[PDB]
Amino acid sequence: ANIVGGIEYSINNASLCSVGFSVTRGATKGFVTAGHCGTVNATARIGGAVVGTFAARVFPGNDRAWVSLTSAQTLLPRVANGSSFVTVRGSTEAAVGAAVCRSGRTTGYQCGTITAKNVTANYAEGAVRGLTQGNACMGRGDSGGSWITSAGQAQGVASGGNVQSNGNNCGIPASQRSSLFERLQPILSQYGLSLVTG
């Protein structure tokens, strides 16, 4: 399978999540995603084919994971934006006020701006601290997907937000949306990963 940020993957033939970013760890290929998407050793599938398993995760507290993939997967420095792509150029963290976009299997590619950093989400499983908040909308299934600047600077992977009855926060005004992401920096250092870029 071609690994691009934003596409859908299922976990243990059950839950759906989105790919964050293509990465490597020495000769091992992988992608980073959301910790709540799977437990260590859960099986990841893309289009019905097995592509890898969860190698590690942290959730709650933080919300992060990396899946190591088989050798046959093709890592790409890209994030899906409809039919086109956003090239990954690095991981410079943007500041409050910067515009940002995110891509996921549920709402597609949405952009907004970063409104706050170091936010705590009180999920039913326990708190998740240090999240950054943006007002791009997102829905159930978007978790783990890519947060990136139009310029290609990777920001993080989707964690969660304030959902309405329709399964997303796209029907509410930007001013009231709270879409949270886990910063990428700490996941790269924690797992010793390197981003695939182009």
């Binding site: 919300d63 039913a124 978790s143 969660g160």
Partner: peptide, 4 residues
């Protein structure tokens, strides 16, 4: 907030 809920996870996703």
């Amino acid at each position: 907030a809920a996870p996703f």
